[PDB]
Amino acid sequence: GSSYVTGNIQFHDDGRIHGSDMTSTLEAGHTFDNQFGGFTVYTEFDGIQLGKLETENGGAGNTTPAITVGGEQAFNITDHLWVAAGYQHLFSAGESIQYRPLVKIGYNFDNGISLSNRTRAHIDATDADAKTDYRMDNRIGYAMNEDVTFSYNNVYMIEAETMDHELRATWTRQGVQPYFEFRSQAHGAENAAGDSLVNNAFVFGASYGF
Amino acid sequence: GSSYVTGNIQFHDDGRIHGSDMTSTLEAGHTFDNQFGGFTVYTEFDGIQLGKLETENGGAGNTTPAITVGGEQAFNITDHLWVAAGYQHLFSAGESIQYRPLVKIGYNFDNGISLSNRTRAHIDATDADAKTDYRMDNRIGYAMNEDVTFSYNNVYMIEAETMDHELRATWTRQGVQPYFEFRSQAHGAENAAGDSLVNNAFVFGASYGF
Ligand SMILES: CCCCCCCCOCCOCCOCCOCCO
Ligand SMILES: CCCCCCCCOCCOCCOCCOCCO
Ligand SMILES: CCCCCCCCOCCOCCOCCOCCO
Ligand SMILES: CCCCCCCCOCCOCCOCCOCCO
Ligand code: NA
């Protein structure tokens, strides 16, 4: 068994999709051990607003944070080919926002390359009765040595047709493992006037396993 | 050298002062050891809204969280008597709210009783030019054994004449140390119509030092 915390600070060069120029995401979870692999539970506070509100021209303004609670069970198919299934639930301001079942598959090469997909349904639980969307996170990671891992993660929303590029460098030292990440977000998103909501985030973060 | 995280979930029976029926406060910091003692830098997210929004009758409604960054130097004067001093900056949504210089004093007894005071000034940093108030935290704590520690903490604002009460039990197990706390807050606070704003909260939290 093991617990873990992770989180970050995000500086946004536009900030409208987040509603603020500075946000934070924090997450804490625990992996119970069974023989299939691990069963992990977790909670994520997403979208905490720190910086100047962005309220005009498509900005989201003063939001309430995205609270996720989630469980996931992973399975090793081979020693290097694994899959998982799990469920996330999205709450916000005391309400159910979405049902989010998810599935994952990935493969880990000996040379330090690893590949993985997460496909996550976004099923509205609110009255807006919105169309179900599907988030895909496709990630390639390179652990060049035991001291640094590099990663590119593509975020794609199938229906909205929006795309995020995420590039990360992680100092995988013993103990707290800080990381820097550049996110090029919201490619495809537009405001009412048809202007681009593209956002660049500089992200400073850290993870710790115990 | 030591790092630490702490955090809680707060369930409120009147969530008006918080704007919400459920909130969280979260905190992380590190202590560097020097000659005088511990120098600790930290950040706190106070007031993350998780529950149904309270907007009527003086409720704060959709707030932005209270962000503290701070630094404190502690001095072990005797093996039992310590003092500390430092500075906290409070901002919210990209705007400095208060300058918060602070001092601390406490005594730890061998029988496991400990007493402490923190006095923190609340200097208005906005254009409102509000009279500087002073916050006292007067805590008594008892470590009955290595498993459970109880504490009482009185919170008092000198000028506003408001008072909080904090009763806490902490499971000091090895690893993540969870805690229950009952809070009765905002004694002396009134909305515009003169009604008491008193809030009672059930608080579940956890901490980890490393
Ligand atoms: C009990 C609720 C748990 C929800 C998530 C756990 C959060 C624990 O970390 C608190 C961090 O305090 C905020 C400072 O942000 C720093 C960003 O870097 C990541 C911290 O590991
Ligand atoms: C139609 C647009 C959909 C976007 C797909 C772009 C994918 C580019 O990302 C590169 C990294 O992808 C890693 C591989 O994806 C998962 C492979 O895992 C399978 C291993 O068995
Ligand atoms: C606790 C904030 C400072 C970080 C730890 C260093 C000081 C440890 O000794 C202080 C003794 O207790 C006084 C703390 O009063 C409550 C602090 O609440 C945290 C947010 O400011
Ligand atoms: C003289 C009557 C004035 C009472 C109204 C204001 C009360 C504010 O003071 C609260 C202090 O009460 C002591 C709290 O006990 C905490 C024990 O630990 C303190 C160790 O320093
Ligand atoms: Na808000």
XYZ file of C-alpha atoms and ligand atoms in Angstrom:
505
model
C 0.000 0.000 0.000
C 1.055 3.600 -0.471
C -0.276 7.118 -0.300
C 0.625 10.092 -2.422
C 0.106 13.811 -2.726
C 0.546 15.865 -5.886
C -0.307 19.402 -6.927
C 0.824 22.529 -8.676
C 0.619 26.266 -9.277
C -0.428 27.447 -12.756
C 0.312 30.843 -14.326
C -1.892 31.588 -17.348
C -1.014 33.996 -20.142
C -4.677 34.538 -21.027
C -6.593 32.848 -18.227
C -10.123 33.053 -19.693
C -10.835 29.303 -19.830
C -9.758 29.147 -16.181
C -11.432 32.434 -15.216
C -8.245 33.625 -13.526
C -4.623 34.391 -14.279
C -3.371 31.911 -11.670
C -4.882 28.582 -10.595
C -3.925 25.455 -8.681
C -4.717 21.744 -8.759
C -4.125 19.473 -5.768
C -4.596 15.760 -5.422
C -4.236 13.142 -2.682
C -4.797 9.430 -2.991
C -4.118 5.929 -1.767
C -3.458 2.613 -3.504
C -4.769 -0.437 -1.658
C -2.867 -3.524 -2.745
C -4.583 -6.625 -4.105
C -3.132 -9.220 -6.452
C -4.457 -7.752 -9.700
C -2.133 -4.788 -9.318
C -3.319 -1.782 -7.369
C -6.661 -0.283 -6.465
C -6.192 3.482 -6.062
C -8.600 5.977 -4.519
C -8.085 9.676 -4.819
C -9.566 13.135 -4.681
C -8.598 16.161 -6.776
C -9.380 19.829 -6.169
C -9.144 21.307 -9.646
C -9.403 24.910 -10.745
C -8.676 26.669 -7.456
C -8.413 30.328 -8.406
C -5.478 32.429 -7.178
C -4.967 35.255 -9.672
C -6.886 38.125 -11.225
C -10.303 37.043 -12.422
C -10.807 36.918 -16.202
C -14.440 37.823 -16.631
C -14.750 39.372 -20.136
C -14.722 38.174 -23.748
C -15.469 34.538 -22.912
C -13.675 34.377 -19.560
C -15.246 32.077 -16.984
C -15.082 34.556 -14.099
C -15.416 33.550 -10.456
C -15.946 29.771 -10.554
C -16.351 27.110 -7.939
C -13.653 24.437 -7.840
C -13.952 21.111 -9.626
C -13.982 18.352 -6.986
C -13.228 14.840 -8.300
C -13.479 11.637 -6.260
C -12.274 8.533 -8.033
C -11.416 4.876 -7.939
C -9.381 2.802 -10.374
C -8.237 -0.810 -10.599
C -5.255 -1.659 -12.762
C -4.385 -4.968 -14.366
C -1.098 -6.199 -15.750
C -1.787 -8.142 -18.921
C 1.897 -8.685 -19.577
C 4.646 -7.345 -17.333
C 4.825 -4.346 -19.665
C 1.270 -4.173 -21.058
C -1.308 -2.944 -18.564
C -4.898 -1.655 -18.568
C -7.249 -0.204 -15.984
C -10.890 0.691 -15.415
C -12.293 3.196 -13.002
C -14.831 5.845 -12.177
C -14.562 9.531 -11.372
C -17.380 11.695 -10.071
C -17.314 15.470 -10.513
C -18.898 17.688 -7.864
C -18.940 21.472 -7.666
C -20.466 23.817 -5.096
C -22.188 20.910 -3.369
C -23.780 19.496 -6.559
C -23.200 16.552 -8.902
C -21.680 17.852 -12.114
C -20.723 14.790 -14.159
C -20.461 11.023 -14.098
C -17.025 10.156 -15.459
C -16.270 6.484 -16.059
C -12.789 6.016 -17.534
C -10.569 3.370 -19.117
C -6.780 3.244 -19.526
C -4.268 1.168 -21.463
C -0.479 1.518 -21.726
C 2.850 -0.229 -22.388
C 6.233 0.292 -20.672
C 9.409 -0.346 -22.692
C 12.701 -1.295 -21.001
C 14.523 1.606 -22.628
C 12.418 4.136 -20.513
C 9.744 4.942 -23.113
C 6.217 4.464 -21.816
C 2.940 4.989 -23.641
C -0.570 5.333 -22.262
C -4.110 6.384 -23.113
C -6.896 7.497 -20.811
C -10.388 7.755 -22.266
C -12.884 9.398 -19.932
C -16.600 9.899 -20.483
C -18.037 13.263 -19.450
C -21.714 12.502 -18.756
C -23.671 15.540 -17.530
C -25.432 15.105 -14.171
C -26.789 18.662 -14.165
C -29.956 20.063 -15.710
C -28.167 21.465 -18.775
C -28.635 17.905 -20.207
C -25.534 18.424 -22.305
C -24.188 16.007 -24.907
C -21.814 13.393 -23.507
C -18.211 14.196 -24.342
C -15.087 12.035 -24.181
C -11.676 13.187 -23.008
C -8.613 11.425 -24.375
C -5.192 11.837 -22.697
C -2.476 10.274 -24.901
C 0.939 10.363 -23.228
C 4.503 9.426 -24.185
C 7.050 9.503 -21.365
C 10.830 9.208 -21.470
C 12.756 8.371 -18.301
C 16.226 9.252 -19.591
C 17.814 8.138 -16.316
C 16.680 7.745 -12.759
C 17.068 11.512 -12.251
C 14.806 13.020 -14.942
C 11.730 11.977 -16.893
C 10.330 13.948 -19.836
C 6.768 13.677 -21.082
C 4.352 14.905 -23.742
C 0.618 14.523 -23.099
C -1.997 15.303 -25.723
C -5.479 16.185 -24.409
C -8.295 15.885 -26.942
C -12.039 16.305 -26.421
C -13.735 14.241 -29.144
C -16.966 16.241 -29.414
C -15.784 19.778 -28.545
C -12.762 19.070 -30.796
C -10.371 20.937 -28.516
C -6.727 20.007 -27.998
C -4.118 20.602 -25.274
C -0.376 20.033 -25.589
C 1.471 19.332 -22.339
C 5.299 19.079 -22.028
C 6.760 18.208 -18.658
C 10.161 17.721 -17.090
C 10.246 15.872 -13.769
C 13.165 15.682 -11.363
C 12.610 12.123 -10.092
C 14.797 12.352 -6.997
C 14.217 10.566 -3.683
C 11.432 12.286 -1.821
C 9.541 15.263 -3.177
C 9.729 15.182 -6.986
C 9.175 18.695 -8.414
C 8.172 19.204 -12.026
C 7.799 21.968 -14.595
C 5.170 21.749 -17.286
C 4.173 23.903 -20.234
C 0.544 23.586 -21.366
C -0.675 24.944 -24.688
C -4.401 24.724 -24.091
C -7.803 25.133 -25.715
C -6.768 24.874 -29.366
C -10.135 24.944 -31.110
C -12.025 26.894 -28.442
C -13.700 30.192 -29.356
C -15.791 32.824 -27.622
C -19.188 34.058 -28.830
C -17.421 36.453 -31.224
C -15.365 33.616 -32.729
C -12.056 34.667 -31.099
C -9.535 32.054 -29.922
C -9.432 31.164 -26.222
C -6.001 29.499 -26.543
C -4.151 29.679 -23.212
C -0.541 29.051 -22.195
C 0.121 27.820 -18.674
C 3.474 27.717 -16.927
C 3.088 25.014 -14.280
C 5.255 24.374 -11.196
C 4.444 21.278 -9.210
C 5.531 18.454 -6.967
C 4.595 14.888 -6.063
C 5.478 12.772 -3.091
C 4.949 9.060 -2.471
C 4.932 7.541 1.024
C 15.020 19.861 7.360
C 11.402 18.799 7.144
C 8.415 19.192 4.826
C 4.788 18.805 5.777
C 1.237 18.944 4.450
C -2.022 19.383 6.300
C -5.603 19.854 5.274
C -9.165 19.322 6.299
C -12.783 19.113 5.213
C -15.239 21.332 7.074
C -19.009 20.683 7.284
C -20.943 23.803 8.342
C -24.379 24.137 9.985
C -24.651 27.763 8.774
C -22.293 28.428 5.998
C -22.836 32.146 5.645
C -19.440 33.448 6.827
C -17.810 30.976 4.442
C -20.240 31.372 1.543
C -20.784 27.599 1.435
C -21.967 24.575 3.494
C -18.681 22.750 2.992
C -15.133 24.082 2.776
C -11.520 22.931 2.906
C -8.329 24.543 4.185
C -5.012 23.166 2.987
C -1.437 23.972 3.854
C 2.104 22.944 2.897
C 5.487 24.105 4.104
C 9.096 23.264 4.708
C 11.351 23.949 7.700
C 15.006 24.748 7.173
C 17.131 24.438 10.315
C 19.562 27.263 11.127
C 21.268 28.571 14.278
C 18.225 30.228 15.830
C 15.954 27.249 15.100
C 13.455 26.434 12.393
C 12.807 28.836 9.556
C 9.519 27.733 7.966
C 8.048 28.907 4.648
C 4.508 27.848 3.805
C 1.363 28.527 1.820
C -2.270 28.118 2.856
C -5.458 27.907 0.826
C -8.175 28.913 3.266
C -11.832 28.830 2.295
C -11.997 26.503 -0.704
C -15.724 26.235 -1.303
C -16.949 22.629 -1.675
C -20.629 22.822 -0.675
C -23.911 24.457 -1.595
C -23.475 28.236 -1.771
C -24.910 30.400 1.020
C -25.856 33.761 -0.490
C -28.844 34.987 1.538
C -28.983 36.782 4.877
C -25.374 37.886 4.918
C -23.872 34.798 3.312
C -20.708 35.532 1.367
C -21.799 33.639 -1.719
C -19.284 32.658 -4.374
C -15.968 33.755 -2.830
C -12.377 33.452 -4.049
C -10.069 31.547 -1.689
C -7.830 33.189 0.926
C -4.193 32.638 -0.119
C -1.412 32.973 2.467
C 2.286 32.829 1.758
C 4.428 33.234 4.838
C 7.781 32.948 6.576
C 8.531 32.421 10.290
C 11.721 32.152 12.358
C 11.430 30.110 15.542
C 13.870 30.408 18.452
C 14.230 27.684 21.071
C 15.009 29.909 24.072
C 14.907 27.078 26.635
C 14.184 23.396 26.077
C 10.505 24.133 26.914
C 10.028 27.855 26.099
C 10.057 28.934 22.444
C 9.191 32.059 20.475
C 8.774 32.772 16.789
C 8.341 35.738 14.516
C 7.572 36.235 10.880
C 5.304 37.575 8.206
C 2.283 36.329 6.248
C 0.871 37.914 3.092
C -2.851 37.388 2.423
C -4.135 37.807 -1.137
C -7.208 36.693 -3.041
C -7.806 36.530 -6.787
C -4.664 38.463 -7.615
C -5.161 41.270 -5.056
C -3.294 41.817 -1.782
C -5.882 41.705 1.013
C -3.784 42.100 4.191
C -0.244 42.349 5.457
C 0.028 39.963 8.398
C 3.160 40.293 10.538
C 3.024 37.858 13.455
C 4.700 36.711 16.684
C 4.358 33.479 18.670
C 5.225 32.187 22.129
C 4.681 28.818 23.725
C 5.683 26.440 26.486
C 5.896 22.633 26.216
C 5.798 20.665 29.487
C 7.253 17.186 30.000
C 3.879 15.859 31.134
C 2.610 16.587 27.596
C 0.721 19.844 28.165
C 1.599 22.640 25.816
C 0.533 26.255 25.752
C 0.996 28.716 22.922
C -0.078 32.102 21.659
C 0.070 33.510 18.169
C -0.704 37.185 17.729
C -1.035 38.222 14.095
C -1.750 41.747 12.936
C -4.328 42.291 10.185
C -3.201 45.411 8.304
C -5.585 46.340 5.501
C -3.648 46.265 2.228
C -6.526 47.499 0.009
C -7.718 51.098 -0.391
C -10.367 50.712 2.324
C -7.919 51.907 5.070
C -9.545 49.692 7.696
C -8.343 49.866 11.278
C -5.690 47.239 11.822
C -7.091 44.395 13.931
C -5.191 41.767 15.916
C -5.854 38.021 15.935
C -4.988 35.871 18.960
C -4.809 32.100 18.812
C -4.527 30.775 22.369
C -4.054 27.031 22.307
C -3.797 24.473 25.081
C -2.884 20.947 24.005
C -2.559 17.695 25.927
C -0.702 14.633 24.633
C -2.309 11.968 26.821
C -0.153 9.276 25.181
C 1.673 8.607 21.926
C -1.681 7.828 20.257
C -4.037 10.734 20.913
C -3.581 14.450 21.545
C -6.409 16.794 22.489
C -6.333 20.553 22.101
C -8.453 23.633 22.670
C -7.807 26.791 20.646
C -9.439 30.159 21.310
C -9.475 32.585 18.327
C -10.118 36.214 19.237
C -10.141 39.445 17.212
C -9.283 42.376 19.489
C -11.052 45.179 17.633
C -13.977 43.425 15.909
C -14.601 41.534 19.160
C -15.257 38.183 17.522
C -14.363 34.760 18.930
C -13.887 31.198 17.592
C -13.612 27.995 19.625
C -11.644 24.982 18.387
C -11.815 21.579 20.095
C -9.670 18.920 18.510
C -8.660 15.260 18.894
C -5.707 13.983 16.864
C -4.690 10.385 16.178
C -0.898 10.682 16.364
C -0.256 7.362 14.622
C 2.872 6.795 12.571
C 2.372 8.248 9.102
C -0.712 10.244 8.166
C -2.142 11.699 11.380
C -5.914 12.261 11.053
C -7.918 14.488 13.310
C -11.429 15.492 14.232
C -12.224 19.045 15.246
C -15.390 20.857 16.279
C -15.447 24.622 15.651
C -17.907 27.254 16.820
C -16.961 30.374 14.857
C -17.936 34.023 14.463
C -19.316 34.739 17.957
C -19.871 38.485 17.932
C -20.484 38.657 14.172
C -23.778 40.068 12.871
C -25.242 40.512 9.416
C -26.842 43.817 8.449
C -30.110 42.956 10.256
C -28.362 42.146 13.561
C -28.682 38.353 13.323
C -25.903 36.174 14.724
C -23.571 34.800 12.068
C -22.297 32.054 14.374
C -21.171 28.966 12.449
C -20.632 25.493 13.874
C -18.518 23.073 11.849
C -17.549 19.419 11.933
C -13.948 19.260 10.764
C -12.149 16.164 9.480
C -8.498 16.672 8.631
C -5.129 15.018 8.285
C -1.423 15.867 8.520
C 1.901 14.343 7.531
C 5.439 15.393 8.458
C 8.519 14.271 6.497
C -8.159 16.611 2.694
C -8.360 17.115 1.254
C -7.229 16.717 0.272
C -7.299 17.307 -1.161
C -5.944 17.337 -1.886
C -4.706 17.271 -0.970
C -3.905 18.585 -0.880
C -2.642 18.510 0.002
O -1.682 19.528 -0.295
C -1.928 20.841 0.222
C -1.111 21.883 -0.558
O -1.284 23.220 -0.104
C -1.403 24.187 -1.145
C -0.056 24.637 -1.716
O 0.064 24.405 -3.119
C 1.384 24.069 -3.535
C 1.423 23.444 -4.936
O 2.318 22.329 -4.995
C 1.788 21.023 -4.712
C 1.784 20.617 -3.218
O 2.193 19.268 -3.016
C -7.907 12.648 -33.944
C -7.082 13.343 -32.860
C -6.789 12.404 -31.680
C -5.463 12.767 -31.004
C -4.436 11.629 -31.007
C -3.016 12.187 -30.870
C -2.016 11.239 -30.189
C -0.627 11.897 -30.124
O -0.008 11.760 -28.850
C 1.270 11.161 -28.896
C 1.448 10.243 -27.684
O 0.532 9.159 -27.781
C 0.917 8.005 -27.045
C 0.254 6.701 -27.526
O -1.132 6.596 -27.204
C -1.502 5.458 -26.425
C -0.786 4.194 -26.890
O -0.853 3.203 -25.881
C -1.061 1.908 -26.433
C -0.021 0.907 -25.902
O -0.477 -0.434 -26.014
C 1.231 26.875 11.551
C 1.683 27.956 10.548
C 3.205 28.119 10.562
C 3.885 26.911 10.000
C 4.515 26.054 11.086
C 5.574 26.772 11.814
C 5.143 27.182 13.235
C 4.904 25.997 14.236
O 4.755 26.548 15.601
C 3.608 27.424 15.736
C 2.813 27.031 16.997
O 1.419 27.112 16.676
C 0.883 28.404 16.324
C 0.118 28.147 14.927
O -1.226 28.753 14.938
C -2.159 28.156 13.956
C -1.473 28.126 12.516
O -2.486 27.898 11.472
C -1.836 27.735 10.124
C -2.066 28.932 9.058
O -1.497 30.223 9.415
C -11.611 39.730 31.278
C -12.839 39.291 30.481
C -12.607 39.444 28.978
C -13.168 38.255 28.196
C -13.607 38.659 26.795
C -12.435 38.510 25.815
C -11.785 37.132 25.902
C -10.571 36.986 24.995
O -9.562 36.192 25.602
C -9.601 34.820 25.291
C -8.446 34.157 26.030
O -8.942 33.050 26.768
C -7.934 32.113 27.085
C -8.042 30.926 26.146
O -7.403 29.844 26.787
C -6.424 29.240 25.967
C -5.413 28.508 26.837
O -4.157 28.618 26.201
C -3.603 29.907 26.301
C -2.101 29.777 26.526
O -1.469 30.989 26.127
Na -15.235 31.051 -6.433
